[PDB]
Amino acid sequence: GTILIDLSPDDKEFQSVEEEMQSTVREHRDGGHAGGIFNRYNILKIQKVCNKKLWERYTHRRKEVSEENHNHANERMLFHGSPFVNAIIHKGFDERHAYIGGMFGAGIYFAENSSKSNQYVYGIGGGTGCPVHKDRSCYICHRQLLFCRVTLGKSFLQFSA
Amino acid sequence: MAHSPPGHHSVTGRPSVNGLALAEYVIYRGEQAYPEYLITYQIMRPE
Ligand SMILES: COC(=O)c1ccc(-c2cc(=O)c3ccccc3o2)cc1
Ligand SMILES: [Zn+2]
Numbered sequence A: 001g002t003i004l005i006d007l008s009p010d011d012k013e014f015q016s017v018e019e020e021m022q023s024t025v026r027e028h029r030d031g032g033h034a035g036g037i038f039n040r041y042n043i044l045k046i047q048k049v050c051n052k053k054l055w056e057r058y059t060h061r062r063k064e065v066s067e068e069n070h071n072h073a074n075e076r077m078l079f080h081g082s083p084f085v086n087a088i089i090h091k092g093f094d095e096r097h098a099y100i101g102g103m104f105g106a107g108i109y110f111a112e113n114s115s116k117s118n119q120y121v122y123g124i125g126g127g128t129g130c131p132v133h134k135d136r137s138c139y140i141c142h143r144q145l146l147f148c149r150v151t152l153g154k155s156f157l158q159f160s161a
Numbered sequence B: 001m002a003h004s005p006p007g008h009h010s011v012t013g014r015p016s017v018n019g020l021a022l023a024e025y026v027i028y029r030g031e032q033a034y035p036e037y038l039i040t041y042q043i044m045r046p047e
Helices: A012-023 A052-067 A085-091 A114-118
Strands: A003-006 A041-050 A075-080 A108-111 A143-151 A155-160 B010-015 B024-027 B033-043
Touching (some): A012 A041, A012 A114, A075 B033, A085 B033, A114 A143
Antiparallel strands (some): A003 A041, B010 B024
């Protein structure tokens, strides 16, 4: 059911997504170990992910959460990096994309910092890096992230290091 | 997959040491996210 529509770099929607990518890069306490050493990206392509069934699955749940939280879905746009991006865009998020060992338990994790999601593109801790060069800081190989619409509803605030 | 805390729909991880870190978030139902954009990129070697 999924089709991918390419956005033109001239499109305001390409530009605003690129700006969210670039402007939410930060330095990481691992010195680049997991995700690489970089202050910015070369954006190669931005595609809109269209799947009617997955979208309706999303909005159905969004309304349930809204009705449980004074008509407030508390919807954000957030980044997600995963070795499983291809399964996600075709079949949706499910238990197999959960971070079983994550600090807030076995759930699906998202980040405001694009660079935080970048640390997970080749696996937890960056895995062994890019499949071709085994480099977590590969400057050659193409990487993919998702920029996602996420319903948080009433969110449990965990103060954390 | 775990469940949200009782009475909640997600968890927010608020940074409490690194002043520059933005928040991270966790949901416990796949239906609570839609993967809207696929971004293909390279990280760039600083000068
Ligand atoms: C092996 O577990 C996974 O499939 C998996 C995939 C992606 C992530 C991931 C993806 C993220 O974008 C992310 C953002 C903030 C904090 C943690 C994050 O972790 C975690 C685990
Ligand atoms: Zn590589």
